[PDB]
Each structure stands twice: as structure tokens, then as C-alpha cells.
């Protein structure tokens, strides 16, 4: 009648409210005084499905609910095995799948077995009734038999099917509705709380053991590990135990010696080092390529600009009358615009941040260059809150001084996506870079951008000398040689050009470094 | 009598009428609308006849001949009852579901599949061959008529075809009355339940989809986490409708309208009364089959909100809003495709109002190296002028931030009774609008009041509404100074 009486919420952490939805949709109508259920006159639910992206443990729900319920063990369908060459057999395997169930329905019908089936990877078996997916031969259309058995003329109130997909929208319109597939819900990339809980479950057995997980600080590990989830999250420790014990297993010879040492601890710094080896679904790890030497604080301007950054961040975070906010930061060439647009994200600490740039796409036609952007901003809308960067507008919408030339579809898509807010409750930040703003004025995008920043470049020696005390590579003698000549010069130049010229000038000679530095600096400026 | 269906008297009477001995009854439309309950009711209401549960493609067998053997065995009426009992009148009925897998155009379709995999000929020929076996009746339920309708119909055998599936915006009350009958008779249902109140959110939410929420409203009350009985409240219904179930909803609007409409002066009242006058012009007049207006404003004053307000103010069957927000990237031809699609939807509806927002960025206008989408322009311009067939009527209201280009390209003449939206006129309007919003209070209002009259102000409210926020975030001391600094920065 009732489940095995031993569940006690074993197996899962991070998905609590969705499993509560599973209770109150599936198990409620079962677990109640059945006399009063006759007083209700409600038929039980069949047809759960789970359309989560890869990972996130949908399969484990599909296993643990079967562990819970007390009935004949569910007849797994390990993807398509019903298909066979002889037509009619593919269509007819399902009757064998449902036969015992409808037998228990008819004979001994009132109190029943409550049989379940898992029916994994519907994306293979079901399609858009054969119209789509090329010319799918009528062997493909076993959906018709399935439909007719689950909600056709003969009806079943004793069995429930489950579904599991990575691409739900490919399913036909028919099945997803009530009576066939009553409940649909994603399994999302869990928050920090759920990630802590799941990591706690995997580590718990070792922590229980006296000699393991010393100084591991799972809460620190959680806040460190941003988008790791599910299978990736537990594969982390599945690699960390291995890194911990490779120390012991090799001592490279025929026999492998670890016998004396069974005191293994699985230290923290192994897991921290291990974090490097797995790569998550979102390619956000490689910040360095954008910021290779970081930001050195020279003068007040960088402070002021980053203050505006945090101001703007907390603005969108707090307000609801601007769910969207849009700003470029203008500068002359080689002034660290991309980097200083990344650092504001690092300060913002938002969950979903992405940098759209031509660096990602090098030779894509304007149309694909638009649809990629569309994917990015759709994902940002799909998140609750986010920060998008558009690096080198000048390059995304192609721009050349000779004649007026650019791709206008890129610009139209971008401008529209600026004015288009996300849905109710969602919020957004969008930020852009460009070495050119008079162009954007000409083509009327600087209107759409809500505000602006003019990031400077190095203007005078009282900035340059402190910037040069930063970034090392120099000492007081070269500094004194410089300071008199530079002070009069009052150079105007950009930091990226600086950081390049310094390296090439210094390469030549231990003595003759300044004689090249200033000699080439004569060119730029004045 | 109509019980368990509760959807509609229309089809329950119309299928029977001009039918009842007929052969070939076929039932189609979108999925749902109780096409199975039709059988489950009428087979019983008729003279105690076998339902003949049949599972559609089950006839298919791997062996040769057994496929046809099944369906010739199945009938069991032409054999004996044609003569037996002195009846010459049968009652046997055969019901098939998901006939698409069983039938195709002439057998060669979806792969030129073989002769014994595809034999429709047996059933095509039984009725129109040796004789019309008119002692029985067939029911075919196809939820995907497009596949089989084109090539499987001959009139006299299959002339019958009836689309089914309207929401029945009052009959869904009658529908759910059945499945709530027991909860009402039994003392479960609430007193605060307004059944029309809960069902009027169900415009496109079909009666077939309209039992999951009822199971959920029962079940949320049942819900016990990790006693009290019979607590079937009403609280569950609105949460069920908003979150667990939404289907074939196909309705998205009223997100361009945001923060409401505020009468910050006589111009807003003026333009809204003008739009009211114009919709009445549409409604109460012949020889004005289509009306076409453009409202120009400078940017960030807000015009899409105004257009959507004019739409929502007036009850219509058909309203739709054309923006690039949905069709970014869709090239010059797909854009006009979408546009003529929604205008054909309008031409089908009997009375409608369509809106276009921001044509300046719909038709891809850029000032430098001026270029645009010639084709979507020239399609839109003729759509402004293309009247519907007869007697139905159309409105087309347009926004843009720039009408000089339109005057230059002659769009302006084609538009009718254009209008002008202003910026914020002066600081009086500005500060009374601030106090109307309620984001500022009287002290800082008075503080702002010092520098109002000395300088005139030409600003859009969308920009104002964005602009206030960063200052609000800023501390109360440096709030007003920063606000006024930005206001003197822009619009001097």
C-alpha cells in the first residue's frame, strides 16, 4: 500500500522543493484514507518527466522514487530497445510493457500493484509524429501506440511512467499535457546552498570516518566552485581521492606498493589542486586571457571608474524600475577597457556573467554573429540576474574608416536587445567597450546606452612614475634618469602600448634601456 | 442530455445532425476536447453496443496477410447481421485512434515504404467496392489531420470532417462542474470560490488541460510534509494556474506597458482622448474600413506604452504587437513574412487593432551610409493601405522616434491623422510627476523647486525614470545634487 517505510530523504541534496512537488503531485493521491479518496473522485497521476540539462541528477530521482515505492521492480527501458526490424514488433513491444499492469488493473483492481516504468531518453523514441526529423519511416511512429495505451479508450489508473530528456522541445506537443505527462519541471544548476548540501552528501561518509577530509572546509569549497554541478561536482571528489592516493600507490616497476600506508587523509589542497583538472560546461575560467597583468591603481581615475562600476552594480541589484541598465566605457585605444569591464564583474559577484567578443568568433558571417549573441542574451534572460559584456563593439559590428561600412544586422540586433528588458522579476546588466564613440554617436547607439564613462589614459609623469613603481622591472637610477625628461614631456599614451614598449625596449641591453625607451617615446605624443 | 462532456452543445448536436445510415464519421482538431469521452458516452447512450477498444497501429503484424486478416475479422457484421434476425440494420461500431501511422497518401510516403507495410487499399475499397456496408459506423480520431486529410478522403465515404476544440469561454464552467460535482456535493469546496473568477484566466487554457489544476488543488490541500481532513480550500487554484500548468497559451503582451500610465499633464489626456476618438471612428463608421495613424515623439518620452494603452483600453477580439524584439536577426524576407502573417490573422478577425513599434529600427535605418530594408518597407507601406476583404475593420497604430525620414520617403502621407507626443514640458510638470510617482518627498521637492523657473527643460520621462535611480541609490545628501547635475548635463 505505502512505500518501503525507509526512504527518510536519502540520496539527494540540492533539489528539495521539486521533490516536494513530486510528493504533492504523485504520492498524495495514493497516500490518504481511500474512502475519502472515493469521496474526492480524482484519478491518480501518471507521467512524470524530467527535462534537465546534462548532469544535475535527474536519473537519481528516477531511481530513488522506484526504491521508495513498494511494487514489482520497474521495467527499465535503457533507451530504445523496443525498436526492431520486423514491423509491428516495435509497435507491439509496449503491450508487453503494460500487460502485467493492465492485468492487475482488471483482476484484483481496487487495491493495485502501482507499477512504474522509467522510459529514459524519450528524445529517441518520440518525435513530431513523423513529420520532422527528415523522413522518419513509420516504424518511428510508436508514439501512436503509446498514446493509445496511456490515455486511449481503455484507461489506466494503476501505472505511472517517467521521462528523462536533455532536449524536451523536440518532443511532440501531444504527450506533455495532463493525463499523459502531468508534471514537467527542469532540474537546474543548483545554487550555492544546494551545492554545499550535495558536496556534503558525498564527503559525509569520509568525514564520518576519523582519518579523512581534514581542513576541507566544504563551505569554502562551495563558494569557490561557482558553476560546478551534479556529475561534475561529485567527479571532483572522484578525482580528489585519486590524487590523494597516487602519493601512496606508486613507489615505476612491476609491483605497485602502497601496503604500509593506509592512513590516507584526502587533504584539502589536493581538492583545490584538483579543481584545475575538470572544466565546467560554461567556458568562464579563462579570465586571464583578457586580464594578463591585472589593474595597477594609478591616480584617482581608476578608483572613480570602479566606484561607478559598483554603484551601477548595486543599482541594478536593488532597483525594480530599471531591470536593465546599459553603459559603454569609452576610451582612446590601448587603455584597458576590456579588462576594466571585467573587473567590475569580479566585484559584482553575479551568478551568470558572460563576455561576448570577436575573440570568441573570428570568421563568422553577420547572421551567425547575431544568432550567437541571441543565444547569449537568451541564456542571460533565462537566469534570474546577470552581467553581459560586449567587447569591441567596433569589431562585432564591423567598422572600417574607408567609406561607411559595417554590418547593420548586428547593430539592429544589439540595439534592440539593449532596449528589450528581460521578463518580470528578472534583472540584467549590459556593458560595452569601444575605442570609438563619435561613430556610435553617428549611428545613434549612444542614445540607447543609458550612460557613459570616458576612461582616461596616462596623462602626466606624476601618474606614470607611480605606475612604473608598480609593474616592477625598474629601479631608482633609471627612475631618476627618466623623471626630469618625462616631467617636461607630459606624455599622453595608453597602458597596453606602455606595457608592450617597456618589454621591447628593456630586452636590448642592461645599460641602454632608457636610451631606447625615451627614443621611441619621442614618436608617440607630440 | 450532455454529461461528462460539459463542453459544448454545438458539436454534440451538429455531429448527430445531418449525419443520422451514415458511414465514415471522422473527428479532428487540436488534441483534447474529450474526443475519447465522445465514444465513452455515446457508445453507452446508444443501444448497449460493444465499445470495440482498438489500439490503432496494433493491426500491424510481421507476417503477411495477418494485418488484413485482423481487420476483416474485426467487423463481424457484414458476415452475419446483414441478413440475420431479419434486421438488415446493425449497431456494431469500430473506433480507431492515431490513424496516421495506419494510413498514408498512396502507400509511398515517408520513405516509399513497402506494400505490406502500407495497405490502405483494403479499407479504401471495402466501402466503395462490392457494396456500401451501411449497417455499422466507424469513428476515426486524428489529432493531426494535415497528414491524412489531403490524400485519404473520397466524398460519400469520408465527406464528413468537423473541426473541434474551442475553449468554450463559458462552457468550461460546465466542463469543470462535472469534476467538481463530487467536491461540491461532499462538503469540500470553499465559500470564497468564484468559479467564473478562476476560469476567466483560462482563455486559451483548454478544458482538456483544465483538470490537472483541479487534481493539484485537491493535492496541495492533501499535502503533508515530512489530523485535519476535508480542507479543500480555494487558495490552491491561483497558484496552480500560475505555476504547474500552462499550455497552448500563445499569449504574450503587456510587458511593453510598465510602471503604468501617469497623467503628468494635459498632453497625455489629449493624446489618449484622441486615440479614443479614433477607435470610435473605426468602430462606428463605414467607408473607413482601415485606419492608420503614427504618433511621433522624441526618444525616451515613451510611445509603445501609449500604443499598448490605447489597445488595452478598448475591448477587441484581435490585437497584436509587431516589434523586432522577437525577430532580431530574421532577415529582410522573414520579417515581412511575419508581418503579413499577423496582418492575415487580422484580416481573418472581424475587428482588430494592430500596433507597430519603432519602425526606425524595424526597417533597419542607419543615418550614415543610409540604408534600410527596402523590401520590408515596401511591404509595410502597402499593408498600411491594403483594406481587408469586406465589412471587418482594422486599426494600425505606429510609433517612431524620427518622422523626418518618413516624410522624406513618403510614408507620412500614407499614414492618416498623425500626432505628436511631447517631452516633459517644464519643471512644473517634472516635479508634480515626481510627487505623483512617489519616489521623492516634499522636502527634496522644495529643494529642487529653487532652480526650476530659471531654466526651461526638454526631457523624456523614460530617461528621467532611469536617471532618478542612481541618485536614489546615492546617499540622501549627495542625491539631489547629482540629480540636478545630470539634469543640467542633458537637456540644456
Amino acid at each position: 500500500i505505502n512505500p518501503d517505510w525507509n526512504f527518510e530523504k536519502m540520496g539527494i541534496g540540492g533539489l528539495d522543493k521539486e521533490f516536494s512537488d513530486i510528493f504533492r503531485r504523485a504520492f498524495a493521491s495514493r497516500v490518504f484514507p481511500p474512502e475519502i479518496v472515493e469521496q474526492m473522485g480524482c484519478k491518480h497521476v501518471k507521467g512524470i518527466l524530467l527535462y534537465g540539462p546534462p548532469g544535475c541528477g535527474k536519473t537519481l530521482l528516477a531511481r530513488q522514487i522506484g526504491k521508495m515505492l513498494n511494487a514489482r521492480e520497474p521495467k527499465v527501458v535503457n533507451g530504445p530497445e523496443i525498436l526492431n526490424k520486423y514491423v509491428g514488433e516495435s509497435e507491439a513491444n509496449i503491450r508487453k510493457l503494460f500487460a502485467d499492469a493492465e492485468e492487475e488493473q482488471r483482476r484484483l483492481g481496487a487495491n493495485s500493484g502501482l507499477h512504474i516504468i522509467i522510459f529514459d531518453e524519450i528524445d529517441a523514441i518520440c518525435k513530431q509524429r513523423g513529420s520532422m526529423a527528415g523522413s522518419t519511416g513509420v516504424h518511428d511512429t510508436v508514439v501512436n501506440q503509446l498514446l493509445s495505451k496511456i490515455d486511449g479508450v481503455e484507461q489506466l489508473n494503476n501505472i505511472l511512467v517517467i521521462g528523462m530528456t536533455n532536449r524536451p522541445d523536440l518532443i511532440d506537443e501531444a504527450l506533455l499535457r495532463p493525463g499523459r505527462l502531468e508534471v514537467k519541471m527542469e532540474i537546474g544548476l543548483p545554487d550555492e546552498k544546494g551545492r554545499l548540501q550535495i558536496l556534503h552528501i558525498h564527503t559525509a561518509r569520509m568525514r564520518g570516518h576519523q582519518l579523512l577530509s581534514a581542513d576541507v572546509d566544504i563551505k569554502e569549497l562551495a563558494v569557490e566552485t561557482k558553476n560546478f554541478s551534479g556529475a561534475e561536482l561529485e567527479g571532483l571528489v572522484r578525482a580528489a581521492q585519486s590524487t590523494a592516493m597516487n602519493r601512496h600507490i606508486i613507489a615505476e616497476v612491476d609491483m605497485e606498493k602502497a601496503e604500509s600506508l593506509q592512513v590516507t587523509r584526502g587533504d584539502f589542497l589536493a581538492s583545490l589542486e584538483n579543481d584545475i583538472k575538470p572544466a565546467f560546461g560554461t567556458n568562464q575560467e579563462d579570465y586571464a586571457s583578457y586580464i594578463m597583468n591585472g589593474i595597477i591603481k594609478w591616480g584617482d581615475p581608476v578608483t572613480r571608474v570602479l566606484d561607478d562600476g559598483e554603484l551601477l552594480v548595486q543599482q541594478t541589484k536593488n532597483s525594480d524600475r530599471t531591470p536593465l541598465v546599459s553603459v559603454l566605457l569609452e576610451g582612446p585605444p590601448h587603455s584597458g577597457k576590456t579588462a576594466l569591464a571585467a573587473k567590475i564583474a569580479e566585484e559584482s559577484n553575479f551568478p551568470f556573467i558572460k563576455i561576448c567578443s570577436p575573440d570568441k568568433m573570428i570568421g563568422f558571417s553577420e547572421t551567425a554573429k547575431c544568432q550567437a549573441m541571441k543565444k547569449i542574451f537568451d541564456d542571460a534572460y533565462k537566469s534570474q540576474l546577470s552581467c553581459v559584456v560586449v567587447d569591441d563593439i567596433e569589431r562585432l559590428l564591423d567598422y572600417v574608416p574607408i567609406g561607411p561600412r559595417f554590418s547593420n544586422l548586428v547593430l539592429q540586433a544589439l540595439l534592440v536587445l539593449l532596449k528589450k528588458a528581460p521578463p518580470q522579476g528578472r534583472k540584467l546588466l549590459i556593458i560595452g567597450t569601444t575605442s570609438r564613440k563619435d561613430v556610435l554617436q553617428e549611428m545613434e547607439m549612444l542614445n540607447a546606452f543609458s550612460t557613459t564613462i570616458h576612461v582616461p589614459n596616462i596623462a602626466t609623469g606624476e601618474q606614470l612614475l607611480e605606475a612604473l613603481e608598480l609593474l616592477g622591472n625598474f629601479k631608482d637610477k633609471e627612475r631618476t634618469t627618466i623623471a626630469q625628461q618625462v616631467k617636461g614631456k607630459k606624455v599622453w599614451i595608453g597602458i597596453k602600448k606602455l606595457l608592450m614598449l617597456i618589454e621591447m625596449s628593456l630586452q636590448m641591453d642592461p645599460e641602454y634601456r632608457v636610451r631606447k625607451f625615451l627614443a621611441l617615446l619621442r614618436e608617440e605624443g607630440a | 442530455e450532455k454529461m461528462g462532456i460539459g463542453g459544448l452543445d454545438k458539436e454534440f448536436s451538429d455531429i448527430f445532425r445531418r449525419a443520422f445510415h451514415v458511414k465514415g464519421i471522422l473527428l479532428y482538431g487540436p488534441p483534447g476536447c474529450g474526443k475519447t469521452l465522445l465514444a465513452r458516452q455515446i457508445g453507452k447512450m446508444l443501444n448497449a453496443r460493444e465499445p470495440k477498444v482498438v489500439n490503432g497501429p496494433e493491426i500491424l503484424n510481421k507476417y503477411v496477410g495477418e494485418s488484413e486478416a485482423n481487420i476483416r475479422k474485426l467487423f463481424a457484421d457484414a458476415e452475419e447481421e446483414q441478413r440475420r434476425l431479419g434486421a438488415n440494420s446493425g449497431l456494431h461500431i469500430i473506433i480507431f485512434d492515431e490513424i496516421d501511422a495506419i494510413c498514408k497518401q498512396r502507400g509511398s510516403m515517408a520513405g516509399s515504404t513497402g506494400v505490406h507495410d502500407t495497405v490502405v487499399n483494403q479499407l479504401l475499397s471495402k466501402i466503395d467496392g462490392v457494396e456500401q456496408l451501411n449497417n455499422i459506423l466507424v469513428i476515426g480520431m486524428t489529432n493531426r489531420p494535415d497528414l491524412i486529410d489531403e490524400a485519404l478522403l473520397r466524398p460519400g465515404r469520408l465527406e464528413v470532417k468537423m473541426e473541434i476544440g474551442l475553449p468554450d469561454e463559458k462552457g468550461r464552467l460546465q466542463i469543470l462542474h462535472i469534476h467538481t460535482a463530487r467536491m461540491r456535493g461532499h462538503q469540500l469546496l470553499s465559500a470564497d470560490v468564484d468559479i467564473k473568477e478562476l476560469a476567466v484566466e483560462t482563455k486559451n487554457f483548454s478544458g482538456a488541460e483544465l483538470e490537472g489544476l483541479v487534481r493539484a488543488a485537491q493535492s496541495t490541500a492533501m499535502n503533508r510534509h515530512i489530523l485535519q481532513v476535508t480542507r479543500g480550500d480555494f487558495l490552491a487554484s491561483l497558484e496552480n494556474d500560475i505555476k504547474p500548468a500552462f499550455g497552448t497559451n500563445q499569449e504574450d503582451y503587456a510587458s511593453y506597458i510598465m510602471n503604468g500610465i501617469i497623467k503628468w499633464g494635459d498632453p497625455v489626456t489629449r493624446v489618449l482622448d484622441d486615440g479614443e476618438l479614433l477607435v470610435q471612428q473605426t468602430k462606428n463608421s463605414d467607408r473607413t474600413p482601415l485606419v492608420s495613424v503614427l504618433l511621433e515623439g522624441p526618444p525616451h518620452s515613451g510611445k509603445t506604452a501609449l500604443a499598448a494603452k490605447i489597445a488595452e483600453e478598448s475591448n477587441f477580439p484581435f490585437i497584436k504587437i509587431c516589434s523586432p524584439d522577437k525577430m532580431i536577426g530574421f532577415s529582410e524576407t522573414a520579417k515581412c513574412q511575419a508581418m503579413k502573417k499577423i496582418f492575415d490573422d487580422a484580416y481573418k478577425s472581424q475587428l482588430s487593432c494592430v500596433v507597430v513599434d519603432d519602425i526606425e529600427r524595424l526597417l533597419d535605418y542607419v543615418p550614415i551610409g543610409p540604408r534600410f530594408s527596402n523590401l520590408v518597407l515596401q511591404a509595410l507601406l502597402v499593408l498600411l493601405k491594403k483594406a481587408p476583404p469586406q465589412g471587418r475593420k482594422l486599426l494600425i497604430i505606429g510609433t517612431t522616434s524620427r518622422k523626418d525620414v518618413l516624410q522624406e520617403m513618403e510614408m507620412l502621407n500614407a499614414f492618416s491623422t498623425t500626432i505628436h507626443v511631447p517631452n516633459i514640458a517644464t519643471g512644473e510638470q517634472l516635479l508634480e510627476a515626481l510627487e505623483l510617482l512617489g519616489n521623492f518627498k516634499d522636502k527634496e521637492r522644495t529643494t529642487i523647486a529653487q532652480q526650476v523657473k530659471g531654466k526651461k527643460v526638454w526631457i523624456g520621462i523614460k530617461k528621467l525614470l532611469m536617471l532618478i535611480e542612481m541618485s536614489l541609490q546615492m546617499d540622501p545628501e549627495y542625491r539631489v545634487r547629482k540629480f540636478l547635475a545630470l539634469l543640467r548635463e542633458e537637456g540644456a
Binding site: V87 | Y63, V64, G111
Partner: peptide, 17 residues
């Protein structure tokens, strides 16, 4: 062209008495 029209067929005879 519409190349790569590669298609597969199924047994439906299963000749047996």
C-alpha cells in the same frame, strides 16, 4: 541536390505459414 538522402528499409513480410 539535397545530398545524403541515405535511408533504411524494414522487413514486413516475415514469410511463415
Amino acid at each position: 541536390m539535397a545530398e545524403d538522402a541515405d535511408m533504411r528499409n524494414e522487413l514486413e513480410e516475415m514469410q511463415r505459414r
